[PDB]
């Protein structure tokens, strides 16, 4: 690993019958336990539900 690690993400799902896709990328300090990222809804946007339910999956 490194002092700062980058990451990328792809996400697909269905919530209450609504299909969506998300992508993301970010960075963090693995040993300090901090991180930041951007998430874009690429399919099924604008999200018809609170994004908060996806936070722990991102």
């Amino acid at each position: 690993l490194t002092e700062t690690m980058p990451f990328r993400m792809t996400m697909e799902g269905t919530v209450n019958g609504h299909h969506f896709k998300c992508t993301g990328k970010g960075e963090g300090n693995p040993f300090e336990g901090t991180q930041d990222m951007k998430i874009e809804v690429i399919e099924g946007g604008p999200l018809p539900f609170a994004f908060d339910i996806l936070s722990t999956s991102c």
Partner: protein, 166 residues
């Protein structure tokens, strides 16, 4: 993003130990108003880039609830308990979603973390806690978001033992 945790007190790092192979996690989050959010995630290391692949199934969220009405105000910080079962790492947590009028909606996270290394190759951590804080900013309505998280893994230092356990 379980690779990004600060481990104190010499607690073994199940996740960092798992590379280059990586790990998976699986979770069902049960909401107090009847919603369910289920996820499977794969974590791999491609060169020096971490790759996350996530599958989501959510259901039974009330139409009039803060989730489907899109009126949630983000999460409170939370605590997860983690311990070995069946040779893999299990996690359990309660989280609280901020709602209009200074109210909260709670949920329970049932998680299993699975290393892609065999159990014989890892040092398994003892029972411990992971403190987390997640903060979200909505850049563009339903399209663009930013997310920050800080996480620390620890034993219980705040309330000390008389029997001399951590």
């Amino acid at each position: 993003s379980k690779t990004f945790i600060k481990y104190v007190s010499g607690i073994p790092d199940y996740f960092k130990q798992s590379f280059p192979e990586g790990f998976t996690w699986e979770r069902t989050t049960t909401y107090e108003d009847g919603g369910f959010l289920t996820a499977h995630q794969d974590t791999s290391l491609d060169g020096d880039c971490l790759v996350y692949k996530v599958k989501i199934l959510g259901n039974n969220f009330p139409a009039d609830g803060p989730v489907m009405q899109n009126k949630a105000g983000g999460w409170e910080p939370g605590c997860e308990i983690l311990y070995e079962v069946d040779g893999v790492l299990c996690g359990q947590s309660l989280m609280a979603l901020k709602c209009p009028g200074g109210r909260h909606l709670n949920c329970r996270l049932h998680t299993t973390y699975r290393s892609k290394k065999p159990a014989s190759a890892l040092k398994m951590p003892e029972f411990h806690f992971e403190d987390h804080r997640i903060e979200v900013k909505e850049v563009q309505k339903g399209k663009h978001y930013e997310q920050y998280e800080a996480a620390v893994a620890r034993y219980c230092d705040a309330a000390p033992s008389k029997l001399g356990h951590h």
